[PDB]
Every structure is written in C-alpha cells, then in structure tokens.
Write a protein that binds this ligand. Structure first.
Ligand SMILES: *[C@@H]1O[C@H](CO)[C@@H](O[C@@H]2O[C@H](CO)[C@@H](O)[C@H](O)[C@H]2NC(C)=O)[C@H](O)[C@H]1NC(C)=O
Ligand SMILES: *[C@@H]1O[C@H](CO)[C@@H](O[C@@H]2O[C@H](CO)[C@@H](O)[C@H](O)[C@H]2NC(C)=O)[C@H](O)[C@H]1NC(C)=O
Ligand SMILES: *[C@@H]1O[C@H](CO)[C@@H](O[C@@H]2O[C@H](CO)[C@@H](O)[C@H](O)[C@H]2NC(C)=O)[C@H](O)[C@H]1NC(C)=O
Ligand code: NAG
Ligand code: NAG
Ligand code: NAG
Lengths: 175, 322, 322, 175, 322, 175
C-alpha cells in the first residue's frame, strides 16, 4: 500500500477480529484474544459511508422526458438528438468508471493509513518498555496484565509505572 | 513472554473491486453504485396515471376511430404509451397535420374532457349519416370517425356551410376537422355537387383555406381517397368559423384542455400494473436512490444517469487476500 | 530542560469546508469558487451596446409601428433585449413569416441603416394615404406602419403594379412587405376593385406568389382582417421585382445590413445602465473570473459554467481544531 | 490525518504562531518563543495557490448565446434544447461538487504531510542527542542556546559537537 | 566503514509534466494522451469507400447535370464528400425540395442502382427533345438534366399526361421530378399551350398538387425561369401516378435504394487516397488509440473525443532534476 | 513529496542506477556499486501502466457523424447544435486537463511512497545494527561483504549473526 502497513509489515488480516476494522491482539498469562479499537473503526466507517453518500447525493436529478418524436423528414434533428444522448452517455460512463477507480484506490490507502497510525500511537505509548518485532507486534519488557493492555487501548498506559522493571529486564537482556 | 499486536479485519468475502492501478482486488465489503433492476411494469408517475392507448394511435383516439376502444374519460395523465405500431390509426387512410407537435402537446395533460361542440342533429340541409365506409366499421355497419362528421350532398345539392362555435367554456379547447381528397371529378360531383370547392377556417389567430387535391392514388385499405386532418387550440371566449363548399369533415366533438407541463410519448408493449414511480422505462419502472443505471435510454421522470457499464463497484472494506 | 517542538498554524477563523469523507470542517482559510453576484444592470457586450426595444417587439420595430417609440438609429448592436410581453407588436393584427429566424438573424448586427427604397410619392395611380386604421393609432389619429405602405384603389380602379428595385448599395439589404386578407368580397372590392388578386415577388433566389385568403374571422382590436408579412435579404447587384393586382402592402423603407456574428434575443425587464461585460444575464451583468456561477441559465457572452449549488468552497488553509 | 501529524500526535495548532503555517517553538535558557519555517510554508502556499489557479484557469470558456427562440409549434425542438441545457447543468454541478470535495480532502492531507515531514527532518537531524516527547516536541539531552536552534532551523545541527555531553546526560538519566 | 543507501532512477530526460500543485516538473518518462496526427487523405470507412463528388453537388449528381462528370455506378458508400462550394449544382437555376433531408438520407447507402422507369421514347404527343437550354450544355449542344425530361407541347397542344409506374423491384426506389416556373404568360403559352396548369403526384403516401408560379425574376446564368425539384421513396409494390397539364419535368431514371445506416456529408477539398480508417476528418484520416484528439470537430466514425489542447502528458517516470 | 523520500531526505536521483526505478548503492571493502530492486520496480511499473491503460480503455467511443446539414433558414437549430458541440468540448477539455494534473500528482506521490517503503524495509531489516545517516543511507556497525548486502536486498539479512559485534561498535562509539 501507500503507507507500507496493510500489505507491508503487517502481513495478513485477522479472521479472528470481527468487532471492527482495526484493532489489537494480546497474548499474556491470563490467555490471549482479539479486541477492536472502537474509535478508529468508527472514524473509518463514518468517513467511508460519508464518501459513498457524497458520491450518491451530490448528483443533481431533474425531470426529463425522452423521447423519439421526429418524423422521417426530420432525421437531421433526430441525428442531433442522437449526438446529444450519445455524448452524455459517453461523459457519464467515463466519469463514473474513473471516479470508482480513483476513490477505491484512495479507500484502500485510507485503511492503510489508519492501521499505520494505530501502530504509531501504540508505539509511542510504550517507547522503551517493549521490543518492536516488525510484525506489528510488541514484546513487553515487563509484565502487562489485562488492566495494563486495557490502559494501552484506552491510551492510558502508565509508562513510569513500568519503566524501571523494563530497564532492568532490558539490561538483563543486554548481554 | 507477553505481547501486543496491531492488525486489521479479514473475512471469507469474495467481492472484488477495481482500482486505478489494480484490478480484481478481493475486498472485505463493497457496494454497487449502478442500478440494473426494474419492475417490468408501467406505473403511475408521481401518483398520476399514464394514458394507455392499447392498439390505437393518438390520432385514432382523438378522432373517433371505430376500431379503437370506446372512448373512456381519462381526465388527467402524466405520459402517453403507444405501441411500436398501433394497428388502429386512420381507418380511412390519409394524414394528420402537425401531428407530432399535437402528440407532444397531449403527452401530459392536467385536465381533458370530451365535449359535444356541433351536434350531428343540427345539420339540416346536408346528409350526416351517409358519410360512411366499410374500412371504418362500427357495429358490423360501415361507419366513420366518431368525433367528426363526413358531410355528403343532400338531395342533389350542397349549400354553402357557414357555422361558428364560441368557446363559452373556461378552458382552451382542442378542435379537430378534416378534408376529403377524392380520386376523380366524378367522385367529387357524386359526393358534393360542386366541382370547385373550399374549406375556410378562421379564429382570432387562425386564417386557413383548404382546397381538396384530386389525384389518382394507390389503394390503401381498398381506398384511393384521403382524409387530411387539422386542429387548433380555441382560446376561451374566442370563436371558430367554418365555411365550406364541399369536402368538409366537420367537428362534432372537441376537447377541453388544461396544460401545466410536458412529457413525451413512450413506446412500449407492456401494460399498467398499479404502481407508482419517479422513473418509468419502456421495460419497467425504477425505484432509484442510485446515481446511475443501465436499463434503457428512453426514460421519463427523475431518473438516474444512463450509462454503458455492467458494474460500478465501490470498495468500502479493506484488502482481503484470503 | 530544553525543548524543540514541531507544530502548525491555527486561528479564530470560522470558515468551513466539506470533504469527501467529512462535513462542516472548520478551517483556517478558504476560497469560494462559485460566482453569485451580478450588477443588476443591462450592459454592453465587449463594449458594444445592445438593442433595447422597450415596449416594442422586433416586428413592431422593423415595420414602422407608430406606437413603438420614434425610431432611433442604432447602427450596431451585440444582442437584442425584448420584454416578456411587448405591448407594441403588430398594430394591425396578423402574422410575420419566418419571424423567429429573422429575429435570430438580427440578434447581433455589425451595421444597420434604414434606407428609402421606393418613395411613397412614386405611386401615381394608387392611393397611398388612405391605408390607415384605428388599430394602428398614432396620436388619436388613425394611422399605419410607417416603413410599409397600404395601397388602396384610386377612383374605381387598381391597375397592375410593376415595380423593381436594384440594390445599388454595397451591402445586403433586408426588404419587407405584406398581404391584406379581408373578411369578405365586399371589403375586397371596396379596397381593391379587382376580385381575384395576387402579389408576385421575384429575386435571383426568391420566387413567391401570394394570394389573399378570405375567411370569416373573430375580431382583434375590432378588426377581422389580417396582415401577413414577408421578407428577404437582397444581395448587392440583385434586384427585387414586385407585380401586384391588389392587397399589396408595398415597401418604402428597407435596411442596409452587414452581419459578422450571432447572438440571441434576451428577455428582460431591465433598462440600460452604462456598463460593459463579457457575460450578460436577464437579472444583471457578471464580472467573471470564477469558473462557475448560479445566477441564471439564459446568459450571453463568455460566461462561467451554470451550476446548481449555493457554494463551491475550496480549502486553502488547514484544520482549525480549537 | 493520513500522515498522523495534524490531529494525531501533534494535538492542536499554535494560536501563537502568526508568521506561517508550519514551524517551531523553542524553550531554552534564553527563554522561549515561536518561529515559522519559511521554506516549507512558501512551498505549501505556492502548491495550494497553483491548485486553485489550475482548477480556475483550465476552464475553457467560449462565447455562447442562450436562448429561447422556438415558437409553440416547435416545442419538440424546445424539449431537445431543454434536455441539452439540463444535461450540461447536471454534468457541471456533479463534477464541480466532487472536484471540490476531493481536492479539499487532498489539501488537508497535504498539510498533514508537510507538518509530519518537517517533524521527521528534525528527528533525523538530532538522532540520539535528544528524546522524543511524543508531543511533536523534543526534549534536549543537552543545552541548546539560541544559535543552536536557529541553526536547527538552518538545518545545520552539528550532531557530534554535542555527542558526548548528550550521551552522558542520557546514560545518567537512563537509570 | 561499510554503507547501504536507498535511491531512485535518474536520466538525461528533459520531458516535463504538470501537476495540480506544480508546473514544468521535469521527469524520467512521460506519455501524451492526446492524438495530433492524421494522414492527410480521404479513406474508406471500415473498408467501404466514400462517394466523392468532385465539382458536383448531390443535386447535380442525382439529376443528370451534363456538366457534372459522366455517371459511374458506385453501388455502395459509407459517407459523401462534397467540396465547400461545388461549381456544378443546378445548371438550370431553381430549387430542390427537402434537399437537406435527401442528402442526409443518401449520406450512407448499402445499395444504389440507377434504373430507367419511363423511357423518353414513350412520349409521342409531347416533345421530349425540345426541353433544352444553353445553360445546361452537354456536348457543345444545348441540353438539360439527363435523368429527367423537360416536356414541351407538340404541334400546338399539350394533352393531359396520365402516367403510372409500379415498383416491381424488390427495393425502395428514389423518384425525382420537377416543375418549370416561367417568367410570363406568353412563355407559358409558348412552351405549353394550356394557360392554367398543374402537376399531381400520388402514391400510397404522397398526395401532392403543384402549380407553377409566374413571377418576374432576375437572370441567373441568363435565365429568369426556375426549375423546382421534388422526390419520394416509392415502396416496393406501391405505384406512383403523375397527372399533368404542362410545366412537367417528368422522370426517366430513378434509383434503387437500400439503406441500413446513416452518416453525413463531409465538406473537403481532398481526394481519395487508397486508405481505411475508423475515423475520418476533412483534413485527413486518423489511426487512433488515444482517447482524445485536437485535429478537427467535423469527424465521421469511431473517433477519440475532440478537445481544445495542445498537450495531455501523463507522467510515468519520476522526478529528474539533474 | 508527501512521503518525504524523493526530494526530501533522499535529495537527488541516481544517474548511476540504470537497471530500474528504485534500488540500492553499496560501498564496502570489495568496492562499490548500484543494483536495482526488481520487485518494487515491477510493482510500480505495473501500477502506472495499469493507470494509463485505465484512463485509455474506460473511454466509451461510439460512431458519430458530424455534421453541417442545416440551411440558412435553420440557423436556430444550427445554433443549438453549436451549443451542444461546444458544451461537450468544454466538458471533455476541462475533465481531461484536470484528470492529467491529478493523476500526475498521484503518480509522483506513488513513486515517493515506493521509495519510502523500500527504505523502511531495509531499516526494519537491520534495526540497531546500523545508523541512519539522513542520506537515505545506512552506516553498518559491522562488516557487510558482498553476500551480506546481497542478503539485505534479498530481504534475508540475518540480524542475530551480527548483533553482538554491531553492539560492540555501537557502544564503543558511545563515548
Ligand atoms: C363569444 O361569446 C361571448 C358571450 O356572448 C362573447 O363575450 C362577450 O362579447 C361581447 C361582444 O360580442 C363583449 O362586449 C363582452 O365583453 C364579452 N363578454 C365576455 C364574458 O367575454 C364573445 O365576444 C364571443 N366571441 C366572439 C369571437 O364573438
Ligand atoms: C442592377 O444594376 C447593376 C449595375 O448596373 C447590374 O449589374 C451589371 O450587370 C451587367 C450584366 O447584366 C454587367 O455587365 C455589369 O458589369 C454589372 N454592373 C456591375 C455593378 O458590375 C445588375 O444586372 C442589376 N441587377 C439586376 C439583376 O437587375
Ligand atoms: C403493382 O403491381 C403488382 C404486381 O401485379 C401488384 O401486386 C399484385 O396485385 C394483385 C391484384 O391486382 C395480387 O393478386 C397480387 O398478389 C399482388 N402481388 C403482390 C406481390 O403484391 C400491386 O398491387 C401493384 N401496386 C399498385 C399500388 O397498384
Ligand atoms: C477479473 O475478474 C473477473 C471475474 O471476477 C474476470 O472475468 C477477469 O478475467 C479478471 N481480470 C483479470 C485480468 O484478472
Ligand atoms: C453544516 O453547517 C450548518 C451551519 O451553518 C449546520 O446547520 C448543518 O447542520 C451542518 N451540517 C452538518 C450536519 O454537518
Ligand atoms: C513551462 O515550460 C514551458 C516550455 O515547455 C514554458 O513555455 C512555460 O513558460 C513554463 N511555465 C513556467 C511557469 O515557467
């Protein structure tokens, strides 16, 4: 993708995650599991829905009636009407097709960006309290129970609460 | 060792989407923007029934074509449905002047009422029941157009006709009349004694003088003669003056007309199906929120934009490599 | 502790913008792309004055309708402005042949000059001043079209008229004439002794023969008679030949014409307001840099594209999250 | 945004900064203050202005005159003209609306990218001589007077000149 | 110390491309979307040759204008090529009724075959070789339109003509005939003894009566008289009936016609250039893959969309500021 | 650019690299040289080529014949045809021009993104086994012969193989 996330460093989607579009997976001593990031999912859904609705609603539709009312001594006018209809059909077809292609690409890239930003928010949240695996997975330098992960998804991970145990495990690992 | 991973949704969905730079990208959820479905029915247009002439043309219906169904009062319509080739048009062969513009005028009518304008019982010095043909059968009996009267000489004379009607109604009224073009002088003399003949028709706006055109013509429905029809809109409190020497197909019935809008004539073999839409198509009606469709170009009403495609599929979900 | 921070602009701006995925997004600075303003005045088009007929139609102006204001010489115009329903059209009731194509031809003229073509004093065997009607009043006095002459029999005769004009000018010239259609033979005889009557008009291109049409008609301005007008463009060095037996409304004045471009006839109730534009509207003129507008569809000149919206606002600043 | 910058990790614009669109705030021993980055701001302005001007100037406008010249026995042709005018209005209205929505969106994302890229440029300049606070602000591991930051805006930060001092302060606070 | 760096392509390219936010961006590789090249020649359209009338108009070609080149049978064409102002049109001056609709009808023809319907040798009580003029010379000798016959009185009489032709062919057939409008009653009498004259033409569809029109006209090619031409499509197994008193320009040849599609008339000074295309232009043909072009608006065939620009260049490579 | 790569932190293209669109330049003891990344280059080429082909193929083209068939008493109808042709020309011209501008911009941003994603790919491959210079270049904290860089381009860089030596040089540089 454009943001290297979705078919880049995260290699695969989660059949397991159904609650939302983007989210988190944990495996700790209490067990494992998926949980969706509600907010970002809502932003993405509301946004994409807004896009579809804007493609649909921006269309102006007035009343028109057509329409074959010229006789066979009025075929030049008939031809003028045909050039008009065919012209409008060509315009609308081209524009509709290209609109679909362009906005589809942007949609996929939008999802990409959303996942990437989620990864970045968590990343900055834990800092040196964990190891980046590259998968989009973080390995904790401390013990992060369920309330702790709760705090990460909340965005309330208390870094100083664990900084020290992390430095200790880290230098324990250091050589 | 404890872990947290960030990831995205996946499913078993098979919907594919195309992209400016990629084709056939399987995806989580998609939505088609293109309307392809119709109801196969002729419906009311914004709660207003169309006028459906089954085997009749607008001309055959306006005039009293015997082979057309008996006249039923449809006081209002939104559009007109004719078939590609109505079998019943002009029972007696001929022509209709400014016919297409008249059909366009009648395409959408807010009020329409047949009205007797010059009674057949008021022609006293002319025969009004001999103007009859086997090509225009009514009830086994040879007959003619019903809203219009073919006058033939009485005894052996055709007195000059002076007749006028004043539109005392409160609405415009569509008036129709005609000329007979025979095949030879002998038919002229036989039907109307006078050899050189005219029909003059006057209004505050109209100043017309018609002369029959004798010519040898090929038979149509066994007839070599021709009937040529004319019409006007008689404004309220204006009057119409007919004068004729012969060959006059006089009005009997005419139509009250109120017009507020326009549509067109739709060609379809389908029929009414107690229905309402904002978009009618010769193949069937469309209940449409979608901005595009591919059903048929000849539409009437607030329809989506006609397009040549089989799919306008919008990606809403995300990449789904199953 | 020392710090460096990266950040972006914000302000108290309330300007909003919409986005494909978001609505009513408050923003730092925006720019509307849609022109909504006009000057309410009728203006020159590329510094060329329009032809503004106040209460006259083009028909009333070309022929000399006395109740149209006195003729003012505008040698050139870019477009023509009529009112929705001009009171001064044809003082004597009737019709104008190919009227719309003529109006279209006259819509934009590079040079226009009235010219005496056949002096009124040159009719020696016909009455040229009795042709006057109460439907064409000037100042309480009954009158007539001033550029065209209603010829009447003198004593008890109407000699055959043979007349020709050779266009010795260097420009094309628009020539106008007419027929009188009376209501009965007695009016015929009263005005022109001869009962069977014609007007023939010839050119290198034109081959016309008009015959008056007697018909009993309803009164308009108290008259049952009708005036029917015809025209041509006489090429330089071609000549126009008239021959008539009666019912001839002869030319006196005609018009030098040079045509280099086209416009149309604008319907507006406004008046001139010493002004110049590249885009005129019945509601007022447009000073236009914008690519779109929503004023009025019936425009003339290099105008922006008409669009149905109330705003096309482009984001230029950035998000202004308070 | 798509690049997580403007309403993501930098949470808010600076009312205080007036010179430009994107820039810096410093707090040192000589005091604090705002300063705008002229280069990137000028490029952004030139880009956006170029965009508006291209939406406007690419429009081709010829002379046309309209236009109700058909009589009441030419109403079929009148209808053909109505279908033409209305068709063109529908086309222009739709295309204008969607063009505006799309390019507005892209403009905002352009801002996002500009802010983010500026942040990354600073980041790449200092490396281990400072700590990322997450704010879009950097906490100096050493003392940065006015010349130091003015020079950062110059893009002339001399990393090794402070390398050892930064290292010392760093390993001192690390535990 | 060892190093790895990530980078991108550059080259000696000078190719520039524009962007929504940037102009004149030099780039690695680009591709123009706009077609600007034509072959400068008139070509077949889908392997079907056009009908190229050199200095003849369609009217001059259909009738047998002697000064038009000899008639060669082209049984099929895709479009018609005329010059802007063909020198050879109507040798004898006059008019062609519904000429533009006829040209449109003939623009693309699947089968065309000239056929004799009424032999010149069958006129026995009328002169069929005196209908001749110096304005229509054939071989030094004064002549006339070759597919049509100008009938003149024989001895001092013009018996009424009654004639019919039944289309025993399997195709529609285009029939052409005319009227002579003379300059005075004395010429009427001189050419056709009968003073008051008509031509009636009848078909299952057609019911026409033409009356010659005397008018004094200016000379064109030395002539003040006029020839007015008319046509119909005679359906298979229908018949056409002529009756005339004088002034009749009778058919001799008519045309078998089969029509399956429509095109138009192209105006061009070019000539055939043994060639095939899907898009023809008055300036030359186009072998077109591109979606847009800027050659010429008056095209025929499956052409790219006409556009006003000199350059539509798509960036494919990347930024290359050396 | 939008992704800071192409005229951002990597400031300049490689005249020296001719093989492809995106790639590497190495300098080791065995010498130096360029080598292009086949994968990303082919992906980009297929994408852009598909874009052009979609701009071209989505066009609907039917047969039309034009067209000056009205006489000088049909000049109103002639004008209706003129307004139609001119209307369609304006539509097509505007849409074509703007389509080209928009897709040009997106294409350049696409190249930007591809480059950035490549840089990030190498970055994630080595981690702390090298220093980011800002050039878009990585300075090895260890010995990377031809086969080592071979492995970097292959995406098979074995990090733990060098981790300890790299660590030694890294912390040696530390003071
Ligand atoms: C049609 O008949 C009506 C009713 O008799 C006429 O209406 C009046 O006409 C007289 C003159 O004939 C006028 O003085 C009145 O002003 C009219 N009154 C109304 C209610 O309109 C009408 O004139 C007749 N139409 C014609 C053409 O004779
Ligand atoms: C109108 O008058 C002009 C000028 O006298 C006539 O044009 C002349 O025509 C003759 C031949 O018929 C030429 O020899 C002269 O050279 C022409 N004069 C000019 C101006 O070149 C013209 O014939 C007259 N119009 C008609 C048809 O009556
Ligand atoms: C034209 O001639 C044909 C050939 O005779 C006529 O067609 C036939 O008419 C006879 C009766 O007279 C029928 O018995 C045949 O069945 C007809 N043949 C066909 C194929 O139609 C035709 O009527 C003539 N057309 C006109 C208008 O006179
Ligand atoms: C795209 O998918 C459709 C079926 O969903 C198939 O018909 C078509 O061949 C595919 N295109 C390519 C080139 O893969
Ligand atoms: C947009 O703004 C107007 C106020 O000007 C508000 O009334 C309207 O509801 C807004 N649309 C939404 C729902 O975002
Ligand atoms: C862009 O380049 C063209 C020549 O290719 C030149 O004529 C034009 O002036 C340039 N535009 C600008 C703004 O420099």
């Amino acid at each position: 993708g454009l943001f290297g996330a979705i078919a880049g460093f995260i290699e695969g989607g989660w059949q397991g995650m159904v609650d939302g579009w983007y989210g988190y997976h944990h495996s700790n001593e209490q067990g494992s599991g998926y949980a969706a990031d509600k907010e970002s999912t809502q932003k993405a859904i509301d946004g994409v829905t807004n896009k579809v609705n804007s493609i649909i609603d921006k269309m102006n539709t007035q009343f028109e009636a057509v329409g074959r009312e010229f006789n066979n001594l009025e075929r030049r006018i008939e031809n003028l009407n045909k050039k008009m209809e065919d012209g409008f059909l060509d315009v609308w077809t081209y524009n509709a097709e290209l609109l679909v292609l362009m906005e589809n690409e942007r949609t996929l890239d939008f999802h990409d960006s959303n996942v990437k930003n989620l990864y970045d928010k968590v990343r900055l949240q834990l800092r040196d309290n964990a190891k980046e695996l590259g998968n989009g997975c973080f390995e904790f330098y401390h013990k992060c129970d369920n309330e702790c992960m709760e705090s990460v998804r909340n965005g309330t991970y208390d870094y100083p609460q664990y900084s020290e145990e992390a430095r200790l495990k880290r230098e324990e690992i250091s050589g | 060792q404890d872990q947290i991973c960030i990831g995205y949704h996946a499913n078993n969905s098979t919907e594919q989407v195309d992209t400016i730079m990629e084709k056939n990208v399987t995806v989580t959820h998609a939505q088609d923007i293109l309307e392809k479905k119709h109801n196969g029915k002729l419906c009311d247009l914004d709660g207003v029934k169309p006028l459906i002439l089954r085997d009749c043309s607008v001309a055959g219906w306006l005039l009293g074509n015997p082979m057309c169904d008996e006249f039923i009062n449809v006081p209002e319509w939104s559009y007109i449905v004719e078939k590609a080739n109505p079998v019943n048009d002009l029972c007696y062969p001929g022509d209709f002047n400014d016919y297409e513009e008249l059909k366009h005028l009648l395409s959408r009518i807010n009020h329409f009422e047949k009205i007797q304008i010059i009674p057949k019982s008021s022609w006293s010095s002319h025969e009004a029941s001999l103007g009859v043909s086997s090509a225009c059968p009514y009830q086994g009996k040879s007959s003619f157009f019903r809203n219009v009267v073919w006058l033939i000489k009485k005894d052996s004379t055709y007195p000059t006709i002076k007749r006028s009607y004043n539109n005392t109604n409160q609405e415009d009224l569509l008036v129709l009349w005609g000329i007979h073009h025979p095949n030879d002088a002998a038919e002229q003399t036989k039907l109307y004694q006078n050899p050189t003949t005219y029909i003059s028709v006057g209004t505050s706006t109209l100043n017309q003088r018609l002369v029959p055109r004798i010519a040898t013509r090929s038979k149509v429905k066994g007839l070599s003669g021709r009937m040529e029809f004319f019409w006007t809109i008689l404004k309220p409190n204006d009057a119409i003056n007919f004068e004729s020497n012969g060959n006059f197909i006089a009005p009997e019935y005419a139509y009250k007309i109120v017009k507020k809008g326009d549509s067109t004539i739709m060609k379809s073999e389908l029929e009414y199906g107690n229905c309402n839409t904002k978009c009618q198509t010769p193949m069937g009606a469309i209940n449409s929120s979608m901005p595009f469709h591919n059903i048929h170009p000849l539409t009437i009403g607030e329809c989506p934009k006609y397009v040549k495609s089989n799919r306008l599929v919008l990606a809403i979900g995300l990449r789904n490599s199953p």
